Amino acid sequence: GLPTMNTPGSCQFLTSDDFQSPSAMPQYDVTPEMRIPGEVKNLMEIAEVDSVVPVQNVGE
Amino acid sequence: GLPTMNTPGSCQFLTSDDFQSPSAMPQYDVTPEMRIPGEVKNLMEIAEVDSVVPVQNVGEKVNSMEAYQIPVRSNEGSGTQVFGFPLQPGYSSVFSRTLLGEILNYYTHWSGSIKLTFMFCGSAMATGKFLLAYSPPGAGAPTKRVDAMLGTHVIWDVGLQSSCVLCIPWISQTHYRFVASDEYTAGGFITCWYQTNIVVPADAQSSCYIMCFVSACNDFSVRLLKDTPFISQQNFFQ
Amino acid sequence: RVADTVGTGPTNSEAIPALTAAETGHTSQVVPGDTMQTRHVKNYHSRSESTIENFLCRSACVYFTEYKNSGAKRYAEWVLTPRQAAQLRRKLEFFTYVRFDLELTFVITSTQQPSTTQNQDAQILTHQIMYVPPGGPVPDKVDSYVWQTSTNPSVFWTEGNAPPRMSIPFLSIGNAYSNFYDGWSEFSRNGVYGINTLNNMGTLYARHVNAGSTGPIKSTIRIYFKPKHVKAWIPRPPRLCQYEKAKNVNFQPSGVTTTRQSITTMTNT
Amino acid sequence: RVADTVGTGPTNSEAIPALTAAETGHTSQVVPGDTMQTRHVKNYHSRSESTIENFLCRSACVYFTEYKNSGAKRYAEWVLTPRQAAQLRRKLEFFTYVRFDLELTFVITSTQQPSTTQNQDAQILTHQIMYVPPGGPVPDKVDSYVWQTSTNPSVFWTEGNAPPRMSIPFLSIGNAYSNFYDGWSEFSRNGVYGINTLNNMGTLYARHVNAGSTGPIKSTIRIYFKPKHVKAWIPRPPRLCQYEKAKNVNFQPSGVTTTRQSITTMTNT
Amino acid sequence: GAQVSTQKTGAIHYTNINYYKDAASNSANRQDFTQDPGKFTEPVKDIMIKSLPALN
Amino acid sequence: GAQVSTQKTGAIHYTNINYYKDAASNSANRQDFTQDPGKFTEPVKDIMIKSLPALN
Amino acid sequence: GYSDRARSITLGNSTITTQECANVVVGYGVWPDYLKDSEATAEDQPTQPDVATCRFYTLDSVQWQKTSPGWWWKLPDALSNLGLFGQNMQYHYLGRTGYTVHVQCNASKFHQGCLLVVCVPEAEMGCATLDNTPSSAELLGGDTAKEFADKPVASGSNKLVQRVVYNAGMGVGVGNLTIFPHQWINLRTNNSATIVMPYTNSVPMDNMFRHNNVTLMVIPFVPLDYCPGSTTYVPITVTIAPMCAEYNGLRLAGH
Amino acid sequence: GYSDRARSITLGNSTITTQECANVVVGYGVWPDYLKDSEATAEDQPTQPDVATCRFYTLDSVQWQKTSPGWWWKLPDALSNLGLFGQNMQYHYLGRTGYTVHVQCNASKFHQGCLLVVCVPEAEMGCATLDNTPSSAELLGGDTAKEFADKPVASGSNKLVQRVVYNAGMGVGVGNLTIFPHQWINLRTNNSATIVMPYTNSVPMDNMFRHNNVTLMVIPFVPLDYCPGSTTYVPITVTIAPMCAEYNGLRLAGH
Ligand SMILES: O=C(O)c1ccc(NS(=O)(=O)c2ccc(N3C(=O)c4ccccc4C3=O)cc2)cc1
Ligand SMILES: O=C(O)c1ccc(NS(=O)(=O)c2ccc(N3C(=O)c4ccccc4C3=O)cc2)cc1
């Protein structure tokens, strides 16, 4: 026995948590990796590109 | 006290988990070890062995030893089709009960080459040549030898060494394929045609036989385990 | 960690870092210093909470079904797709190809159903959530041999504890999940359109292990997906018009923007 | 980690790695390169999720029984055998001899039984699952001295907690469990056929410790087996025809394959 | 081994040990900072230098 | 002691310490990779070499 | 060398020179090259078409009206007629390609207008009927330009594609299509667009007569406009060239 | 030395030479050898029969008809009559053996047919009645070949074995029996099968007059066939030789 006292915060599920996990099928061998062109690693890669602004508006 | 907060995932039992455990009777001394012949350590040891394919099916050619033999006879016009079945193990009703296919039905994926050894069990004076062709999916199976040639074929010339291995190579657009039927991926068509009709002298039977064997290659792997559909039960065995 | 501004000062030489055709498909980089003069400003702002992973790694509810514990539908069934919830779907459809592992958490909550049954008392319903890989067996009656979980994974969860969690690795025939597939499955180009076998992780069935209370109880399995270890390639426009189908990109045409008054108005309607 | 393909090219010498009798009981190894030419292809595919252990180490339900908490059968009894479920049994019968440890997990779920009893309220039933080694004492009445668990292992589990788990080591008179025994136990070759004492780990009895609610409650003990530390020898054909008995290999003859049309048809019926 | 790395600070140290057999069950890689906008922005063959007009 | 070994990766590190007296209560040996098809395949006395026919 | 108005792309036999234009837009930063062994999923031996399936195949010209909706040509299905590219995709199960999509349109210096030339990989089009998929004869070209419309396509039981310029037939705002490699053909100055597509797919090689990996869309954002008289027929001509073609699995002729 | 058509297996006094055949199939990769002290469960002193219980005991010949179902001979119970092997198993409680199962069948070069020669360790046969076990006089031979049938054995209260070629009397597909060491006797060329069984059991030594560790099955997959006339009686003769016999616990004669 290793004494522990559960701090409040336990037995809940957040929608933004991040933890270790139990696997489903264990020892599954994931498919290889291809270097498919145009990899994205940050949203600022996408946000720094021009897009046409629809400045004019009336009703049609 | 050592503070801990139980992450969600606790207090459940999976059917594929793996953990330490409390023992029952503690300090039990397990029996010794014998080196009994023929140890298995991988399913690919079993899957790379030949098994007879029951290519022929009709309705009573599926309840006898007529299933395994492929009828070959001398027909005057050459370009007649000997057999033809798609390559789609673990779904195809030709490989559904073979050794390779039965291991395959416990897996969802498969990848690797497959060897189809055809063994001529005719007379010892009967001859014949066959054009064994595998045509990848790109069209809906040849209906003539002149179309089958274009695929990946191997002309088998008989006369000693009564088997010839047509090795089907991996042609797929993905690194795995489904064992269960799908139409994003398919496995093409395996056909056999007469290259040069069966020439049989006198006093020798003019109807011979071929046997088809299915085996896995050494570039073969299966991934993602599921459980078979070809076994069933109702009530428990009393 | 973002970039920093540096002192400039007047400019009267032929440099014009402003004037440059944007007709060449090149999005020019212009700093404050180019259109005015701005001294050395240090920025400590961080462009982290904007990473591809952190963006997508948030648990979103993809679905929920209901199943009576005593009646007809004693089990629910779901073909796994993120295409059942608008919220998660639009985030994924911001990339053409994505690769990731999944964390499936199930939040099962039970509700008693009105009935005239006498002495209704529950004895802690236990739920079974079972994953059936693609091309598995399919249960019918809830007592079928299929539920023996011979090889098929399953989480057994007693009610009133931390919700069940399990991981799934990256399972795809290809090397990425395609969020948009232009093509058919059939070589004759008919049938289903973009119903390719790469984003079809079989079915997930759930049912009550026990017979619960004497009366009827209806339980609601809510499915949560959380993308871990994400790598996303080829960015693409976010969806504009509302979704119509769970396997097609069908839509009804609608506005290009929200309307306002004139071209020179300074206040949105 | 699987093997790799290497460049070949044309072949016009007397090698013929294709033509070779398969009449010698030798399964020849032929690569792509032998029947065509295929360049150097690297394969990173992994033949792990196909290991003997990983195959068999999946928890499968072997059985389940029911026992009233107030009436007649207040206890259940089971002679341990994996031969009660088709699913697990067929996997084990893919090997002639297997050696392994067991992890027994019991998923006990209670269901209230319809009755006209007044004020039925449970006070958290506690279940006792007891392992009785082969040649132990046998309980009758549920109050028998046998249930004192003097030396016999037992798990005491209060309902509404993580399901009980216990390990059993490899217990066999021999050095492997025989999944197929050809022989009798009697020297005169009569009686039981292949009911050898090597796969007979005694009995497992279970009952309600407490008297539960005033009314009747029926509980359902579901037994799960999970083979750890597996070593399997001598491979053998998987079962074809359906199982008929839990201790014999009795069967009714059935098809050799699923039927189709002609020998040259390209579509399964 | 125990992987120790700084907590994401604005302007320290946490032990983390993977406990599962698969590497598909490890916690997300929330920290993974890289930026390289020379892709979608400015995909041109010959980079336009900011000191003269792009066209002649 | 703590046994540290790589997680099964496709193409890292987990502590694991056995906590029970028996060695029949340790977690399964899911990682245990070996292949040796020179058994059931090709059980022949004299190995047939791929360059000539098996029979004379 | 001197002015950047000049460019000259020689692939095999055909050369496209242009007197005046701008820079070549290279992919996402990748130029199409052959697939290496560490990506090769095929186990068979691939062919090398080289120069004989790398010439600039000049697709159908379409006439830009004063007000015109826009156009699109699918990429493996605009070349399924022309030359040896149309042969090879049919005799081979798998194919892998890159492109040089060069859209050329000239105009006088008294004309104005502005095309957006984008190349949308994986353009999965919606449908007028909100529960039916497109047909394969409306959705695809035949090397012909399919054109959109400026009014919603009316719903019924029809399987005709939903075609509205402003939603691009995909249900995404037209103004956001610029993420994808592109260029503009502003008639004021700059008379061609060159977009070098590298092979983009989730799998290393895929059948091309069932899957269309790229879709070129040419959308006029500023309508063609001019004064009375002059010329009134400014066509847009598309010249596409396969680049680094590679096939596998030599089957037989099919669909 | 020269052709591989030749083979010659000398064990003790009897030699089996064959003019034409193929390779010897060695077990699972193990050749029968004596049990070492690190496997010896017996505490008593074993005998050494040596050459006098290692000769090729020629069991009953059976005649292959044009269409014939197949045959099987249990292994410790086909030799329970012949020579000193039949004595020793009865005077000794424990026994340990390996085998050289050599099935020989000749045919002319105008005959065709093909036998599968497998050796199934632990062949536990089913029964026609789905709740009764086999008898010990139908299930076992007496050194005689028991033959299957091509039609299901009708159910009743009978304890006769379920005998159907295609299920092999075990309820496994006949076509999958090839895992086990075997060989084929294709009459086209190759006129014998040699299968060297090493001792296979879960325990190191076991009684042989109550347990049958191996079952030889000879199943014709391609029926014997020929033209009218010629010879019409091609027998199959089985020669089995114990190999590395070892006994313990010298009791008295029994059953
Ligand atoms: O959950 C599964 O694993 C499981 C549930 C249903 C199932 N399908 S079955 O093979 O049709 C089957 C159907 C019913 C029973 N069964 C009974 O009929 C019964 C009566 C009384 C006590 C116990 C039981 C019991 O198990 C056993 C098996 C298999 C496994
Ligand atoms: O659970 C077991 O360990 C246990 C249960 C029953 C048992 N069998 S017995 O030896 O027949 C036995 C039978 C009954 C009682 N017993 C009573 O009759 C009683 C009356 C009032 C209070 C307590 C008790 C009580 O224990 C004690 C022993 C032994 C042990």
Residue numbers in the entry:
A (entry chain C): 1 to 60
B (entry chain C): 1 to 238
C (entry chain A), D (entry chain A): 13 to 281
E (entry chain D), F (entry chain D): 2 to 12, 25 to 69
G (entry chain B), H (entry chain B): 8 to 262
What does the paper say about this structure?
Rhino- and enteroviruses (family Picornaviridae) are important human pathogens. The best studied inhibitors are the so-called “capsid binders” (such as pleconaril, pirodavir, vapendavir, and pocapavir). These compounds fit in a hydrophobic pocket in the viral particle, thereby preventing binding of the virus to the receptor and/or uncoating. Now 32 years after its discovery, we report on a novel druggable pocket within a conserved VP1-VP3 interprotomer interface of the viral capsid.
To gain insights into the interaction of the drug with the viral capsid, a 4.0-Å structure of the CVB3–compound 17 complex was determined by cryo–electron microscopy (EM) and image reconstruction. However, difference map analysis revealed additional density that could easily be fitted with an atomic model of compound 17. The compound has an L-shaped structure with a longer and a shorter arm, allowing unambiguous docking. Modelling revealed that compound 17 binds into a pocket formed by two VP1 units and one VP3 unit at an interprotomer interface. The cryo-EM structure indicates that there is charge complementarity between R3 and the conserved residue VP1_R234. Hence, we propose that binding of compounds in this pocket stabilizes the conformation of a key region of the virion, preventing rearrangements that allow transition to the A-particle.
